[PDB]
Amino acid sequence: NALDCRERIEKDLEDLEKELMEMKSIKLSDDEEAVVERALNYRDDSVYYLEKGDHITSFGCITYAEGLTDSLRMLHRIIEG
Amino acid sequence: ALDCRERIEKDLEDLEKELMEMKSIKLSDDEEAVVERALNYRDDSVYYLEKGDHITSFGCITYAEGLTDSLRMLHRIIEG
Ligand code: IUM
Numbered sequence: 001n002a003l004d005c006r007e008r009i010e011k012d013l014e015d016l017e018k019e020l021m022e023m024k025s026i027k028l029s030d031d032e033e034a035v036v037e038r039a040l041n042y043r044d045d046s047v048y049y050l051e052k053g054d055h056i057t058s059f060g061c062i063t064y065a066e067g068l069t070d071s072l073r074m075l076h077r078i079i080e081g
Numbered sequence: 082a083l084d085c086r087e088r089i090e091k092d093l094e095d096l097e098k099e100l101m102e103m104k105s106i107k108l109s110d111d112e113e114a115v116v117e118r119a120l121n122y123r124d125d126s127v128y129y130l131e132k133g134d135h136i137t138s139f140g141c142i143t144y145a146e147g148l149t150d151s152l153r154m155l156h157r158i159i160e161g
């Protein structure tokens with residue numbers, strides 16, 4: 001499956017990075033900041049497994065991180081302020 | 082591997098329990114959207130597993146786990 005090929009994972013990582021920076025652009029609670037930190041840990045893990053050639057684990061890590069991050073984004077409508 | 086049938090089946094059973102429990106506490110409207118999305122992605126995982134698309138199923142379940150775990154991290158029993 002092309003979902004876990006190198007180029008797709010790389011682009012997933014780039015997109016996650018932008019999303020994390022986006023969430024860092026607003027005030028988050030300490031608990032939400034802990035979610036961000038966990039997402040960053042899983043980003044780092046995704047990169048590790050990609051670099052070791054384990055695309056399935058890498059893909060799992062990035063999608064988990066995307067879930068963590070997308071939840072935060074959904075809890076903060078951009079028109080919330 | 083993390084995406085073998087046995088592992089995905091266990092992931093799906095575990096997530097169902099987590100979601101049923103999250104489903105039945107007081108949630109904000111925004112959190113309800115997240116729970117709905119997690120349930121939808123669990124259903125997608127179930128579907129792709131039936132089709133034998135293990136990578137796709139695995140992506141769906143891990144995404145749903147991330148959505149769900151984020152909520153769990155915002156609802157610590159002992160907040161501190
Ligand atoms: O396959 U490249 O950066």
Ligand code: IUM
Pocket residue numbers: 096099145146147149150
């Ligand atoms: O999806 U959970 O621990």
